[PDB]
Every structure is written in C-alpha cells, then in structure tokens.
Amino acid sequence: QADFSGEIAELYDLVHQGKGKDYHREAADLAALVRRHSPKAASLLDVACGTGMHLRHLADSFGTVEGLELSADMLAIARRRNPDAVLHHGDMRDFSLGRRFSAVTCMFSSIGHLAGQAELDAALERFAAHVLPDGVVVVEPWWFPENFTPGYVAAGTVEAGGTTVTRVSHSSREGEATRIEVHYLVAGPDRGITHHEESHRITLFTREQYERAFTAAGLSVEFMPGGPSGRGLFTGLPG
Amino acid sequence: DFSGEIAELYDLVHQGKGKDYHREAADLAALVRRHSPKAASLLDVACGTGMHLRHLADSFGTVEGLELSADMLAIARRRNPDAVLHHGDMRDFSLGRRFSAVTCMFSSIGHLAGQAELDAALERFAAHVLPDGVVVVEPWWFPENFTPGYVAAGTVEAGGTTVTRVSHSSREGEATRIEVHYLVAGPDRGITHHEESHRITLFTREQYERAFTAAGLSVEFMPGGPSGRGLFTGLPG
Ligand SMILES: Cc1cn([C@H]2C[C@H](O)[C@@H](COP(=O)(O)OP(=O)(O)Oc3ccccc3)O2)c(=O)[nH]c1=O
Ligand SMILES: Cc1cn([C@H]2C[C@H](O)[C@@H](COP(=O)(O)OP(=O)(O)Oc3ccccc3)O2)c(=O)[nH]c1=O
Ligand SMILES: Nc1ncnc2c1ncn2[C@@H]1O[C@H](CSCC[C@H](N)C(=O)O)[C@@H](O)[C@H]1O
Ligand SMILES: Nc1ncnc2c1ncn2[C@@H]1O[C@H](CSCC[C@H](N)C(=O)O)[C@@H](O)[C@H]1O
DSSP states (O other), X not given: OOSOOHXXXXXXXHHHHHTTOOHHHHHHHHHHHHHHHOTXXXXXXXETOTTSHHHXXXXXXXXXXXXXXXXXXXXXXXXXXXXTSEEEXXXXXXXXXXXXXXXXXXXXXXXXXXXXXXXXXXXXXXXXXXXXXXXXXXXXXXXXGGGOOTTOEEEEEEEETXXXXXXXXXXXXXXXXXXXXXXXXXXXXXXXXXXXXXXXXXXXXXXXXXXXXXXXXXXXXXXXXXXXXXXXXXXXXXX | OOOHHHHHHHHHHHHHTTOOHHHXXXXXXXXXXXXXTTOOEEEEETOTTSHHHHHHTTXXXXXXXXXXXXXXXXXXXXXXXXXXXXXXXXXXXXXXXXXXXXXXXXXXXXXXXXXXXXXXXXXXXXXXEEEEEEEEEOOOOOGXXXXXXXXXXXXXXXXXXXXXXXXXXXXXXXXXXXXXXXEEEETTTEEEEEEEEEEEEOOOHHHHHHHHHHTTEEEEEESSGGXXXXXXXXXXX
C-alpha cells in the first residue's frame, strides 16, 4: 500500500516512537519559529497532520489549532488524539476551509507525496490562501536530489505492551523520486506474526523547485538547513 | 526444509543471536575427552551448515557430518572443503565405520516424530560409536519447560546485508509449532521477505532416556548446556 491505511496507520505512531521521533521537541521548535515571524500568532493549521502528534503539542501554544489529512485511517487516530480540535478530511492540493491562520505547517516531508511541479505549486497556493497576511507558511521538504542516498537501508525494532514491531526500508532512485519499499513484521504472544508491506514514491524536488512554488504563491521564501529531520525547513511570508 | 534463501541466511541469523560455535566446539571437545581421552574422530549428525564441524576439525583427527538437506550440506561443504560430509537421514544411515564421538546438536533431534523414530536414531548413533566413545544429544525443550507464546526478534548486519528474524512459538499437540519470518535487505539487492514453519517434538526427559537405554547406552543429563535445554550423554555397554 501507499495510502497510510489499515494496519500501517495503526503501527505508525509506535514505529516512529521507536525511531526516536520527538514530537514534543519538534512542536516546541516549530512554535518558536512561528512566534519569531508572527509574534501575535493565535491559530495554526497543520496540513497532512497524519496521526495528530504535532497538533497535540501545538495546542498548548496556540488557542486554535486545526488539521487537514487525506487518509481517513490516519485522521481517525488524529481525531481521537485531539478530541477538542477541528480536523478536516482533505487534499493539500485543493482544500478550502474558509478561514485563515497565523501559521500553515506541513511537516515530515509530507510534501514529497506530491508528484511534479504542478501539484507542488497548487499545494503552496492553497497554503498561501489559508495564511494571515502577517503569518508564516512552514514546509519541511524531502531530501534534495544532491543529498539523496540510493541503496539506503533502515531497520528498527520496537516493543510496547506486548506487541513487537520490526520495520525495514530500502530506498532507490526512480526517475525524479525516491522509491522506498517498507516491510513490517508485527508479533505478539496470542496474535502470532503478521507481515505487511508499503511502497512509496517520494518526489526529489530541487531546492529551486520548492522556491518556485513559494514564489508563485506570493510568499517570500527562506531555507534553513538542519531542521527537525536533517532535511531543513522552508519558511514563506506573504507579501 | 532448510532450503533456498532460508538455508543461506542461517549462519548470519545465528551469529546475530550470539551463538558462539567456537566456544561450543571447545566445550564439546573437552566433554568428549572427559569420557574419551585419546578421542580422534567425530561424526556430527544433522550438521547443518557445518559450523561446529569447522571448529571441531581443529580438535579431532577426523570429523565427518551427516545432513538431510542438500542446500544446508552445500554450505557445509563450502565451509569444510576437506571434510567428508554425507547426504542422509539420522533415522536410517550406515557409514561403515565408527567414531570416538557421535554428536547431534542444537535440538535437531526434535525434528523426529514419536518414540519409534527417536529410538531408531539413537540406535544408529550407538551403532556408529566406538566402545570407548560417547554419544552427545542436545534435546529440544521438555514439555514442562516449554514456554507457549514466546516471541523472539533480532537483527544483524554483515557486509552491508541486514537480516531481521522474528519467531513465534505455540503448543501443537505434543510439539512446538514455531513460525519464523525474515526480512533481508541490502543496498543493491533490495528487500525480500521469507517465512517458514516447523513442528519440533516435545519429548519428555524419560522418552530421551528410554531411547538411549534401548540402544544400549548408559545415559546422563546435564541441565543448561549450549542453549538452556541441557545435554544428554550416552556411553556404550
Ligand atoms: C541520512 C539520509 C537518508 N536519506 C533517505 C534514504 C531513505 O529514503 C530515508 C530512509 O530512512 P527511513 O528512516 O526509512 O525514512 P523515513 O521514515 O524518515 O521516510 C519518510 C519520512 C517522512 C515521510 C515519508 C517518508 O532517508 C537520504 O536520502 N539522505 C541522507 O543523507
Ligand atoms: C527461554 C525459553 C525458550 N523456549 C522456547 C520458545 C521458542 O520456541 C524457543 C526460542 O525461540 P528462538 O530463539 O526463535 O528459537 P531457536 O532459533 O533456538 O529454535 C531452533 C531450535 C533448533 C533449530 C533451529 C531453531 O525456545 C522455551 O520453550 N522455554 C524457555 O525457557
Ligand atoms: N495530498 C495529500 N493531502 C493531505 N495529506 C496527504 C497528502 N498526501 C499524503 N498525505 C499524508 O501525508 C502524511 C505523511 S506522514 C507525515 C504525518 C505527520 N505530518 C507527521 O509528522 O507525523 C500521511 O498522513 C499521508 O496520509
Ligand atoms: N532426519 C534428519 N536427518 C538428518 N538431518 C536432519 C533430519 N531432520 C532434520 N535435519 C537437519 O537438522 C538440522 C536442524 S538445524 C541444526 C543445525 C546444526 N546442528 C547447528 O547446530 O547449527 C537441519 O540442518 C536439518 O536439515
């Protein structure tokens, strides 16, 4: 699969907890970035919010937080995690919520699930359409082509509460994208062992392709390297 | 049936579990010499990929192996190019000679079904041991020590190749049903999934002792041993 559904969606949080992803830390850094650019910020929209881990922590920093997510199964986990937030089922390429926000964020390389400049431009225009004029757009990109490592293998095992999950991924270059194949073994005393597979195309947009998408949406763009996952961060300001 | 890529993964997965065949071979050679000081030949039954044999060849004059799986035997033959390895069945084989020691390690004996097959294997072991030699059998778990629902998971990397292995064990009549899955991944080879399922018989201690006695061997059990399952030794007479 490629749609973050079913068993894969239910394993997502445990797998990334096992890999060391710290959403509390990332949310605090993201909130500080937002407050640096929009010092009276009060509202945030997290696009491709997945299971809602960032939003759960951002709600402490901003009086209104909302989310948008394409996968119904991810969205169901996010809604249970964030019962008091308004979350939306929808597509970052075309959504329309009828309000604006101090910040529009798109984290953890979700933007790489778009194919081609036309989809990238359309998403960035939607983000610009949802940001207040004194607000900020934040996009965590995928790897740039010059930084991509073909043949990369990641392997990790986590156990929690009687469930053991092992995850192995392999990445290769496929045209202008990463082809990443992911396999899971899920095990437990009563349930036995189950095997699951995922296969994704994640687009290797160049730095200049990202900057063009921000520019076409009317945002001034800046790239900061490092960031939450080693891939840096883009910030866009209206005007 | 220990074939194909599963056979080729065996050594890497057991290195990752920390199985130390060099130390087991040293301990086994010392055990044999406690019961047979001038011991100079050894037969390893169900020798698998020949890891014990490779280290035991440093301690004995002659080492030979017996193995049912052709794919395992080929790895054993690559690793032990100067040894004589036999394609055959522990329940019914005849090499035409005897050995100071006949060994059957790592619970291979648990692939037999029922007392009759167990007895017949032990009789073949006794037929191949010298009158001053020793038979060594590492058993599978006894029923009272078997742990249903056990999950094992381990990952190892060697030469750029990563192998992850997960097993699940359950009770199936008087046997353990063990399901094993592997994920194998390397930079150029990509990622593949493999799986296998085995029935490993839960013989009681008294059943093992019955098989040794019927073959004319005095029998003693040492708990603990290379795998936590103990070791049986048998002496002719
Ligand atoms: C150091 C490094 C890694 N990778 C690539 C190689 C490979 O594609 C990825 C491998 O690691 P895994 O931990 O399975 O990836 P995630 O779960 O973080 O992927 C997603 C994250 C977010 C959304 C979608 C997917 O990083 C590079 O391209 N360059 C690098 O320097
Ligand atoms: C502590 C303990 C374990 N087990 C069982 C539970 C489970 O069936 C097994 C341990 O699982 P794994 O490490 O996958 O087993 P191996 O690869 O050694 O099995 C092979 C045996 C012979 C040839 C090949 C493989 O021991 C018990 O029954 N009791 C115990 O106290
Ligand atoms: N076109 C699209 N519109 C909205 N969400 C999308 C999308 N394409 C992929 N996604 C979502 O992007 C997410 C990538 S995983 C990242 C989730 C979350 N931001 C986190 O940091 O954990 C998945 O939940 C997937 O369903
Ligand atoms: N009837 C039989 N005769 C000979 N070998 C057998 C057999 N039944 C199973 N086997 C073998 O027993 C082995 C169990 S795995 C143990 C391998 C080796 N003794 C080691 O310590 O690593 C496999 O190689 C399998 O092919």
